[PDB]
Amino acid sequence: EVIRNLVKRYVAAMIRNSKTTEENFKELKQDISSFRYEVLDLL
Amino acid sequence: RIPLQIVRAETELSAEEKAFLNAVEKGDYATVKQALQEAEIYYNVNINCMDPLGRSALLIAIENENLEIMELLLNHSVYVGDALLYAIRKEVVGAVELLLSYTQFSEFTPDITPIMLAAHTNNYEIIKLLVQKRVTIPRPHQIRCNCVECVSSSEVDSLRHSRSRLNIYKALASPSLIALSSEDPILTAFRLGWELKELSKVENEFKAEYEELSQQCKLFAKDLLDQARSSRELEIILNHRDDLAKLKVAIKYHQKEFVAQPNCQQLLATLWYDGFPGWRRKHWVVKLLTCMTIGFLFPMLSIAYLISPRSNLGLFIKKPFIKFICHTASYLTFLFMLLLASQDLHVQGPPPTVVEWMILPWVLGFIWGEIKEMWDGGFTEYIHDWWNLMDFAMNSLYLATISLKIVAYVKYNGSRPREEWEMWHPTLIAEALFAISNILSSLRLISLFTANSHLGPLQISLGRMLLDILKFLFIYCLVLLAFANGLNQLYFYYETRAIDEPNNCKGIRCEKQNNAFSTLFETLQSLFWSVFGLLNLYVTNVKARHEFTEFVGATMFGTYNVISLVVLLNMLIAMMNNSYQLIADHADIEWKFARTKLWMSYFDEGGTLPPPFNIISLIQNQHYQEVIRNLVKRYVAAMIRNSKTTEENFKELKQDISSFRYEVLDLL
Amino acid sequence: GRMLLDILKFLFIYCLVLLAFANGLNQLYFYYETRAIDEPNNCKGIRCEKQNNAFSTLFETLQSLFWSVFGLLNLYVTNVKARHEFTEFVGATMFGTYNVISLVVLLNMLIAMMNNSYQLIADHADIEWKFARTKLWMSYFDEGGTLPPPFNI
Amino acid sequence: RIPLQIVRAETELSAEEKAFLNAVEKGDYATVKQALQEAEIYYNVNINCMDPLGRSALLIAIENENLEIMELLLNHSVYVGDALLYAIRKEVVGAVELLLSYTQFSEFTPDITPIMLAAHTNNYEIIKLLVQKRVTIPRPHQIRCNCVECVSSSEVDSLRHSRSRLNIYKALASPSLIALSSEDPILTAFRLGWELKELSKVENEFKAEYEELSQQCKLFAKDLLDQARSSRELEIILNHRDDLAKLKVAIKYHQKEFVAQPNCQQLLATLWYDGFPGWRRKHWVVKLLTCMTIGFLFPMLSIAYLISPRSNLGLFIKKPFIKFICHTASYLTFLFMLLLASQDLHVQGPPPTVVEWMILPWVLGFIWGEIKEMWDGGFTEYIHDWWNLMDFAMNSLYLATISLKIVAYVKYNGSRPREEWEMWHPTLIAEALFAISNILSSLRLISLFTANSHLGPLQISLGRMLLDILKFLFIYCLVLLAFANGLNQLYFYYETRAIDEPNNCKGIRCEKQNNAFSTLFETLQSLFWSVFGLLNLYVTNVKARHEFTEFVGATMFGTYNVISLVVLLNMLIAMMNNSYQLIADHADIEWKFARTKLWMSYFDEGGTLPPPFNIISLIQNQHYQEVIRNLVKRYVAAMIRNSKTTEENFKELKQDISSFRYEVLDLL
Amino acid sequence: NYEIIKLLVQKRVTIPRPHQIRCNCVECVSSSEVDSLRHSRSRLNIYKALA
Ligand SMILES: CC(C)CCC[C@@H](C)[C@H]1CC[C@H]2[C@@H]3CC=C4C[C@@H](OC(=O)CCC(=O)O)CC[C@]4(C)[C@H]3CC[C@]12C
Ligand SMILES: CC(C)CCC[C@@H](C)[C@H]1CC[C@H]2[C@@H]3CC=C4C[C@@H](OC(=O)CCC(=O)O)CC[C@]4(C)[C@H]3CC[C@]12C
Numbered sequence A: 001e002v003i004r005n006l007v008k009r010y011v012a013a014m015i016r017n018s019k020t021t022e023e024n025f026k027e028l029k030q031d032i033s034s035f036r037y038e039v040l041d042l043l
Numbered sequence B, D: 001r002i003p004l005q006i007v008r009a010e011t012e013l014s015a016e017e018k019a020f021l022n023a024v025e026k027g028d029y030a031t032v033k034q035a036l037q038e039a040e041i042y043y044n045v046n047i048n049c050m051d052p053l054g055r056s057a058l059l060i061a062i063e064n065e066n067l068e069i070m071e072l073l074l075n076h077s078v079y080v081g082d083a084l085l086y087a088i089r090k091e092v093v094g095a096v097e098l099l100l101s102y103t104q105f106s107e108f109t110p111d112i113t114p115i116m117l118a119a120h121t122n123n124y125e126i127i128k129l130l131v132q133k134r135v136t137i138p139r140p141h142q143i144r145c146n147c148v149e150c151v152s153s154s155e156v157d158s159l160r161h162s163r164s165r166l167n168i169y170k171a172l173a174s175p176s177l178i179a180l181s182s183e184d185p186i187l188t189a190f191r192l193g194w195e196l197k198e199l200s201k202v203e204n205e206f207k208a209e210y211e212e213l214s215q216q217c218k219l220f221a222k223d224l225l226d227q228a229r230s231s232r233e234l235e236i237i238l239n240h241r242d243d244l245a246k247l248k249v250a251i252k253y254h255q256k257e258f259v260a261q262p263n264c265q266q267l268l269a270t271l272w273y274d275g276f277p278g279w280r281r282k283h284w285v286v287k288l289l290t291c292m293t294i295g296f297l298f299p300m301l302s303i304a305y306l307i308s309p310r311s312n313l314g315l316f317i318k319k320p321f322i323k324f325i326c327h328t329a330s331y332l333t334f335l336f337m338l339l340l341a342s343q344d345l346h347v348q349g350p351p352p353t354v355v356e357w358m359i360l361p362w363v364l365g366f367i368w369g370e371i372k373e374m375w376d377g378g379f380t381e382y383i384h385d386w387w388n389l390m391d392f393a394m395n396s397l398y399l400a401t402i403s404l405k406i407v408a409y410v411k412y413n414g415s416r417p418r419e420e421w422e423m424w425h426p427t428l429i430a431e432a433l434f435a436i437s438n439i440l441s442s443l444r445l446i447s448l449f450t451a452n453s454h455l456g457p458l459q460i461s462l463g464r465m466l467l468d469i470l471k472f473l474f475i476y477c478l479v480l481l482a483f484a485n486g487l488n489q490l491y492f493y494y495e496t497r498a499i500d501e502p503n504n505c506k507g508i509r510c511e512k513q514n515n516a517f518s519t520l521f522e523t524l525q526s527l528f529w530s531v532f533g534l535l536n537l538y539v540t541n542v543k544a545r546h547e548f549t550e551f552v553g554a555t556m557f558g559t560y561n562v563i564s565l566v567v568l569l570n571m572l573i574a575m576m577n578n579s580y581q582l583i584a585d586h587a588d589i590e591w592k593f594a595r596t597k598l599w600m601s602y603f604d605e606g607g608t609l610p611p612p613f614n615i616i617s618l619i620q621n622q623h624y625q626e627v628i629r630n631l632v633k634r635y636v637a638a639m640i641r642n643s644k645t646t647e648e649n650f651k652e653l654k655q656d657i658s659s660f661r662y663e664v665l666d667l668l
Numbered sequence C: 001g002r003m004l005l006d007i008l009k010f011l012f013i014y015c016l017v018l019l020a021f022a023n024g025l026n027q028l029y030f031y032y033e034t035r036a037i038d039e040p041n042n043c044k045g046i047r048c049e050k051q052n053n054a055f056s057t058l059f060e061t062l063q064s065l066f067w068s069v070f071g072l073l074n075l076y077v078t079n080v081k082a083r084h085e086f087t088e089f090v091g092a093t094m095f096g097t098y099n100v101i102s103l104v105v106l107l108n109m110l111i112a113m114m115n116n117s118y119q120l121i122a123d124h125a126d127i128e129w130k131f132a133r134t135k136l137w138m139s140y141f142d143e144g145g146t147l148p149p150p151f152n153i
Numbered sequence E: 001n002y003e004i005i006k007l008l009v010q011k012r013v014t015i016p017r018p019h020q021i022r023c024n025c026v027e028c029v030s031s032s033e034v035d036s037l038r039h040s041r042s043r044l045n046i047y048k049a050l051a
């Protein structure tokens, strides 16, 4: 049970540390362009 | 093959519970609202379900900075436990206010409170929002407290108690939490940093965290001082009493960065050159000539102060730079007389000469000044100098010299040649003590390297490398004693009388060295002098034909040489290199702190005359408060600007784009 | 050349220590000064085969403390003809403390200072050298001084 | 007051020309299209107008990655000069293809061409697009070319010529441009890096740029090798002929990173331990015992190879590790015999003893092996070793020793005691030469530290610090010669005959040193030995009572001591510290290169027997091409992935958002 | 990546067991002789997965 608690805490802490690249900007551009194409088609 | 499975299993989400969480993550407001409305009727989706990462719907909404979905979840009465802590850690203004207006796994320890976490984040907006209410932080006990509660908590759970104390001190040492809710932020920062340094000393573990908290408080004080925009404000700050009272308080708490502030140093320099208004812009030759002229006239200035303090010359010595020059010139003349004191020697206990009669008043002035400083400043201040130790040694040696001179004068009258004097004759001991005192007096000039720009930081560096030297001293002494014991044990059998020696000289200080290792004292001296190569090799030889014993002694001596020179001395060089590289970054700040202490030592009325001539509130609080308010405003604005000028940012951007996309698609 | 500045800075502290211990040793030893005739070869001072009167005068004391840096001062110079063993031990202790400072403490500190300064000035060595070499080259661009000595006269 | 105005004025934009440029910057397609259509009718807006930064409308559109507005401008026939260069530098795929299909200020020099700029950017997509057409890059001339065109261009404009050459070599050294359009990328990278290193040597200026281009080519070759996925591919690569031919070519071009490749080293290690299959996983004691057993049996293996090379023992010595062990054991036995050679001495020119008779075949084998290596390998390879210099010195000294022994044997018969022999007697010179040869032979073992993991990189570091030692040698020698000249000039008047000396011994190697500075040769030796403290101080004394001369000589000697020890030796220590810190990062690669050379030296059939026993295509090209194609694909994919895994990115995001906003607003 | 690793471990997935550091079985020596590069790469990948 102690190990289960430690593993939960470690996973949460390491995910937090990782959360706190050019591919990110590419994904942002992709999202904007997909939204733009959807809006243009709908209109 | 290695089978891989889930050792610690959990409760999996249902197909709907996963679609609902995915909708929350994507920010689709319409589907989340539909799921929330359907859960009230059909009870098919648990709105409080976690995810494989442990986050619930509310935590997902908070992490994405989606205020609309967050508020929608809050209106449906979802579990909100510890959500405020996640909102505060995320440093999102919307989540707090939303949440403020309203044993599972948690990423925060049970002792964390909203105000404590906000102070940990050092976020001025959220800290101010929480301080707007009635919030409190528990008072930590004394560093060395021994009450029943402290010992009970330490014994029951040392880890929990230590963690709680560290969290409390992290909360209190927050620059934003000191900017608010603190009468005197500068004094609070000083004392809090001092207490954190003391805790770092006491707490062998967690030492780095307390050190960094103390350094953070020191930097906060320095930045508050940096926000000053006029000389009036700086004077008001430094002269505030809880002159230069607050500067003295800063010096007491070892606030080196605060003292070495460029504006603080500029004000201290304007005070330092009281007489000369344009000393900053002068040539080297002009400054040197002025210093020489002032130094050569120190007796005149001292006499003028003695006769009439209120005159163009009487009060000219009370100026700090002039007073320093006069004291330095007096000490230089004393050293010159000490040098001249060695320019009939058969008289046993001779009367003091003219040079000694001139030296005596300087020694009396030194002793009187030391005891006057002890009487005025106190005891702790006297022993904190660490330069008063050499002064005490000098004064004691001079007093012993005078006592032995008196004893030899009143116990001997005849003129017997020195060749047949006793080994412990009073005159010889007095002369040896006087020579040691002369060495110490001339070495006392090191403390004046602080006043110089080129010699000050170098003196600081050498003084701080003396600590590495001291650390190496212990291991060297252990090795030296070990090999001295071995060599003495081997060689003490062949000890020879001084008569047997070719010139009736025994020991290593003879032209032909002998009996190098016969006694432990002589063995220690021989191993000392072999470091400098002054011990000859034939000292490892004995008259008897014991070639094995001679070779074994020679091998012990060679191993001692190898260690002490090849291994220990090079290790000392490496340690000095590392320490000097470490302390080269902070040399300027330490030097400016030391020089400020030196300058302030000459600001006081007492001790104006150098030896031997020394033996012959509401409105102030209001002004300080308004200046502090201006400083806090400026500091907050500057630090917010600096922070403004992560993957979570891109996640928030994606969340905003997706929410906009879903809204547009629904509307169309 | 740029490390010569660190050497110069260390020179002041070394000279202060040297003068202090020279004053102490001279004060201790000037009573036992001996004439050159009394010496075995009529040679007085430290540049004799048997060193003598190392600390009898301040000038000789300064030279003796200088040569002890290089190990050329023998230990028996701390010995006097009279049986004043306390005086001899005190002089030997002063000499040993001077040795300890000047060699163990001061010389290693000088080495550390030189290491730091050389590491600091290694980045800009090329630019400084090119500036100096440009000055040297331009010194030979002028008509004056074309003929080297002795042809210039 | 200082008036501030525009010294170099330009032509300001009109109110419309500014609104049109602002519309282009914001990405509003509708307003830009309206302005373009209105300009054709009213001619009120110059479509080619610049901005305060010099950018035109097309440059603004390219910089914002706005393909729609760009294409709209292109359809209206705007000025397009040098726009392709900006599109290529921006590394935007859309701009090129758009522009490809179709003296003002420019940010690119006139010698820049589209393919050259694309190669500079090292962008595989654009480089491939440009190579799809028929594009060429000018061939740079020889590094030391002396044709009329090169000298004419250098004299007319040295700056332009140097810039053009550097740009061409930047284009050619592009990893992407070598991945395409190159028959053998590995060989191309090797030779291009070699030529760039040679240019860096020749070009005193621009040295850093050529160095970094060469390093980039070396890294490209190493990465191409890194993309290998099987041992078959690695063998095909290393064995390709334009065995291990390509590895030898890499070693020739000093491709240290390519040679120190872990897979290359693993293959070389499998070749190195031919006999032992499991040497990688063995204990220290087992390896040591095996090495000792093989070394003690080296004569047996040599004899077995001599008698029948085709046997379990005849060909057991041809294995590289076994051959190395046998040669090392042979050299160790030679050194052991050299040590034993010093265990009647009055015979003038005695016959060689049994130990000398055993030593002679080893010397003959050494000489024969050296001349055989010279005959087989060549001259440049022989002199590139830099270890053959010590071997040549040893062989010459041994030959001189043998010649002098023969001369003394056939010119002397009587047995005269050595005390009355001539100073230049042949036996004495022969013995001195033999002793020097013994020193050199024993010192020759340094080259075997390469084979060891712990001793190899240390030897590399010490060898590379020998260069700093050599650099310090010149300044030390200048100082030494200067002070030797001064001391000799001062002291040569008091030169005394050897008879006048107490023991008829003259010079500094006597028990009482004398005439230390009488002659220049003796003065040089005396200043040398004072470095180690072996020169006594009384050598600065003269018989005459010239106390001024003695003091001046002593002061010269003291200044020499101060310089050579305090100043020069500490500066040497500082230089060594800096150089060792610099070369500690690359120690492993250099050591692995040196060890690869050592291992490959034992791969050849020639020189198998150690002394003294030495004196008794289309399908290969196709396989290499397919392997290279796979490597290039993998390298391109990996480098694109690495690059994927700026303020201009945020500017492009803002441009996309604003263009979407304007389109939506117009539609609504 | 904890999420994807958990997703894959939700199924029945296995990772091959590396042999002894100094293993001398027929399979290890056969793989080493046939392709040393491939065998070394596979071992390193397995230990990267397990660590
Ligand atoms: C160096 C050898 C020859 C022994 C010298 C003995 C004294 C003559 C020297 C040694 C240290 C020197 C002192 C080192 C420090 C200073 C700082 C200096 O103050 C300044 O640098 C000017 C700026 C300022 O302090 O306000 C005044 C000279 C003084 C007292 C020096 C005066 C002369 C001193 C005492
Ligand atoms: C050190 C003092 C006592 C003089 C010793 C003389 C020799 C007995 C020593 C000195 C250097 C030694 C050599 C240093 C280098 C090596 C590398 C070593 O090769 C290895 O490290 C095993 C791995 C491999 O090379 O394949 C073989 C032993 C050998 C030749 C050593 C054999 C013994 C040597 C010649």
Ligand SMILES: Cn1c(=O)n(CCCO)c(=O)c2c1nc(Oc1cccc(Cl)c1)n2Cc1ccc(Cl)cc1
Binding pocket: B551, B554, B555, B556, B557, B558, B559, B562
């Ligand atoms: C510590 N020490 C020492 O005290 N004396 C003085 C002896 C009394 O004259 C040495 O002479 C000495 C030494 N260390 C050494 O070199 C090493 C280095 C590593 C391991 C060993 Cl074992 C020795 N030597 C030189 C030497 C080498 C071989 C032989 Cl056979 C004999 C002398």
Ligand SMILES: Cn1c(=O)n(CCCO)c(=O)c2c1nc(Oc1cccc(Cl)c1)n2Cc1ccc(Cl)cc1
Binding pocket: B473, B477, B521, B524, B525, B526, B528, B529, C089, C092, C093, C094, C095, C096, C097, C100
């Ligand atoms: C400065 N100095 C010195 O001048 N001489 C010459 C004296 C005249 O022969 C030393 O012999 C000496 C020394 N320093 C030392 O080692 C330490 C190290 C740290 C603290 C102390 Cl107190 C001593 N020694 C060795 C020694 C140790 C114990 C004893 Cl009882 C006696 C001698």
Ligand SMILES: Cn1c(=O)n(CCCO)c(=O)c2c1nc(Oc1cccc(Cl)c1)n2Cc1ccc(Cl)cc1
Binding pocket: C011, C015, C059, C062, C063, C064, C066, C067, D551, D554, D555, D556, D557, D558, D559, D562
């Ligand atoms: C270079 N040199 C030297 O050769 N001898 C040998 C002379 C022959 O015995 C020294 O004795 C010497 C020295 N350097 C020194 O210390 C400094 C340090 C900085 C500047 C000066 Cl000027 C001197 N000394 C000690 C000394 C100081 C003052 C006096 Cl008055 C006399 C001797």
Ligand SMILES: [Ca+2]
Binding pocket: B385, B387, B388, B391
């Ligand atoms: Ca004091």
Ligand SMILES: [Ca+2]
Binding pocket: D385, D387, D388, D391
């Ligand atoms: Ca060779």
Ligand SMILES: [Zn+2]
Binding pocket: B141, B142, B145, B146, B147, B148, B149, B150, B151
């Ligand atoms: Zn308590």
Ligand SMILES: [Zn+2]
Binding pocket: D141, D142, D145, D146, D147, D148, D149, D150, D151
């Ligand atoms: Zn050409």
Ligand SMILES: [Zn+2]
Binding pocket: E019, E020, E023, E024, E025, E026, E027, E028, E029
């Ligand atoms: Zn196996």
